[PDB]
Design a protein around this ligand. Structure first.
Ligand code: HEM
Ligand code: HEM
Ligand code: HEM
Ligand code: HEM
Lengths: 146, 142, 142, 146
């Protein structure tokens, strides 16, 4: 993908301002509520039976933070996202057996959380850059499914 | 389908955000044409297609007016949105793919404007509601 | 929603092709796992997921049995597929995106096997029908 | 996209066996019936009030053939599809004002028509190659939309 300077700057700005141990948990918790089928892989997390329980779940929070932290490698080198996530893609496919469409759903929830975090500053132009970036990450994560 | 829980959630959310419908519509459509430039083909008849323009603001009022109607007719969206469906089906011929796009933009706008009100519970219900609206608008399509 | 015209078209088509449901199911699922390898994660509990395998054939019969049920309960898919929805929603947790994939594969199979019967009219109606089925299966999801 | 020899061979095989003035019309006619909103761009093509009328429409048939012939340039050089369709993309966007989602729908109808044409020879492997090829064409046609 040909990244513009605005896109590169916007992505760095957003991620540098996000508090991972807040945004991460919020994102995964939102995804587990809005797209309940994503709960399929978290049976060991315990009670995910309702929005309140999900929000109070420490394991959900921990994993959400892990996911957000997992995006840093993409932010650092936006021109090599495919190769950078190759191993992680294989892991999700062959070890975790995660349906890759869930990545798109998680990305949508992240966009919603980021929008709430930045309010008026999350313009259409910023949204375009953020979604473009997330789309590349999502594509890369599902690339090694065979 | 929308449960009683979904209906109460949407009515309650709309009760809180309804006052800002004009702004929501303007913001939603402005995002749509910027983030998804392909949607602009439906407005090729306008003098121009630019964010926050008089045309976009007016269209914002139209769409949010449709949403307001949907909230009132939430118990039966198909019947409630009949006229809108006929319009979009025979005159406009708007590909349903765009309803999904606009719905996503509407959710984004609401999150930016009402972060505290747009909880995950409000989100799941509104999402189900908007999908129902998109399907009701597609009723007369084929 | 399905009109009387759609219902007649689907009932008529199924009357003709129903005799081959086992083969349709095997071919459809086999195409799904080959063309969309990501769907294989839902069958990770099997030694492997390969086209035309005994497991795929058995599962094909299950799915086509669900479709046969859908045809009989075509007037009210939501109620007709309640059990299946509960199953897919809480026990299986199948992302609805996959229903769209399988429906496409089903249309492809039917076109290869029954080119004369699968006219554009039969196509539009069966498409609306399968979308209705996917939505009915999604009923208990969220 | 990295094409395998099987994919290259399969695409050539399929297209060389298709009778464009039969498959083209059938494809467009099917699209106009299954996805009626596509009729938006054919107000000057005549009677399209029903399936039978569309099937008898000479202008629809003529345009279906044009679309099929339009794929030959992609078949000829599968490694330069993006650049090859750049001009056509700008045309559909700024001259014809065609919603690019319709490209995906048309592609799906073509797959159905091709499937009916080849029957059992249209295996899952053949379907995968065909859809992969069409997806690249569809992507290329929508690239110049701004
Ligand atoms: C933005 C997309 C995502 C990123 C960047 C991402 C990143 C990660 C990372 C870095 C790990 C740790 C791998 C390791 O053990 O070294 C992981 C594990 C995992 N991910 Fe993903 N992931 C994403 C989305 C998802 C989604 C949407 C689901 C499913 C709904 C999912 C389910 C899992 C599971 C089950 C684990 C294992 C957790 C455990 O062992 O307790 N991931 N992910
Ligand atoms: C939430 C979904 C939507 C609702 C509730 C909605 C509602 C409406 C309403 C009430 C009208 C006005 C009818 C009249 O006054 O005669 C209208 C017109 C129109 N809508 Fe929709 N609409 C929706 C989505 C869309 C989308 C996604 C597009 C295309 C990208 C679209 C394109 C149009 C166009 C072209 C018009 C005609 C306006 C003009 O000619 O300037 N609509 N809409
Ligand atoms: C046309 C849509 C579909 C219908 C009508 C359908 C129907 C069924 C039926 C009747 C069963 C058996 C239920 C029982 O044993 O009580 C079943 C099971 C199942 N379905 Fe669905 N299904 C559909 C789509 C899908 C899709 C797209 C996937 C995933 C890619 C899927 C994955 C499963 C799984 C994993 C099982 C259990 C298989 C096993 O554990 O061996 N189904 N389905
Ligand atoms: C596989 C995808 C498609 C290809 C390769 C394609 C190809 C073509 C070509 C080669 C032309 C002639 C351009 C020229 O030299 O002037 C054309 C024109 C046109 N296409 Fe597309 N097209 C595709 C899909 C579509 C779709 C899905 C629609 C809309 C439903 C569409 C609507 C039109 C229209 C309205 C014209 C002008 C017809 C006329 O006035 O003569 N095309 N297309």
């Amino acid at each position: 993908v040909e990244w513009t300077d605005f896109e590169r700057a916007t992505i760095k700005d957003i991620f540098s301002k996000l508090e991972y141990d807040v945004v991460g948990p919020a994102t995964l918790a939102r995804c587990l509520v809005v797209y309940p089928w994503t709960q399929r892989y978290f049976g060991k997390f315990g009670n995910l039976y309702n929005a309140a329980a999900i929000a109070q779940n420490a394991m959900v929070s921990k994993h959400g933070t892990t996911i957000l932290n997992g995006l840093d490698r993409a932010v650092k080198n936006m021109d090599d996202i495919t190769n950078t996530y190759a191993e992680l893609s294989v892991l999700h496919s062959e070890k975790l057996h995660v349906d890759p469409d869930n990545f798109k759903l998680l990305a949508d929830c992240l966009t919603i959380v980021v929008a709430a975090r930045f309010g008026s500053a999350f313009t259409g132009e910023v949204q375009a850059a953020f979604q473009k970036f997330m789309a590349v990450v999502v594509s890369s994560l599902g690339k090694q499914y065979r | 389908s929308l449960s009683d829980k979904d209906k109460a959630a949407v009515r309650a959310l709309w009760s809180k955000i309804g006052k800002s419908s004009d702004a929501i519509g303007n913001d939603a459509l402005s995002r749509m044409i910027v983030v998804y430039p392909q949607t602009k083909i439906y407005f090729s008849h306008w003098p121009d297609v630019t964010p926050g323009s008089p045309n976009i603001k007016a269209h914002g009022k139209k769409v949010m007016g449709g949403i307001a109607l949907a909230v009132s007719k939430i118990d039966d969206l198909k019947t409630g949105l009949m006229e809108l469906s006929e319009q979009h089906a025979y005159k406009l011929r708007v590909d349903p793919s765009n309803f999904k796009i606009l719905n996503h933009c509407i959710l984004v706008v609401i999150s930016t404007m009402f972060p505290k009100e747009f909880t995950p519970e409000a989100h799941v219900s509104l999402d189900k509601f908007l999908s129902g609206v998109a399907l009701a608008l597609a009723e007369r399509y084929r």
